[PDB]
Amino acid sequence: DVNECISNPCQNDATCLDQIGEFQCICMPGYEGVYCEI
Numbered sequence: 001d002v003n004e005c006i007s008n009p010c011q012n013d014a015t016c017l018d019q020i021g022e023f024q025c026i027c028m029p030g031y032e033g034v035y036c037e038i
């Protein structure tokens, strides 16, 4: 139950996709971080 990608998990205006029991935060080209922020 419950998901991970509800209100855009990313923190840099990244694209969210589908994954296996996880979230898919697609950061920009040449970025860093897990939730697209660093």
Ligand SMILES: *[C@@H]1O[C@@H](C)[C@@H](O)[C@@H](O[C@@H]2O[C@H](CO)[C@@H](O)[C@H](O)[C@H]2NC(C)=O)[C@@H]1O
Pocket (backbone or CB within 6 Å): 013, 014, 015, 016, 026, 027, 028
């Ligand atoms: C999904 O992948 C991301 C890495 C981005 O390239 C996304 O594109 C951007 O999506 C936002 C939506 O919040 C939009 O506002 C931007 O204009 C768009 N970027 C460009 C250059 O179109 C992509 O969908």
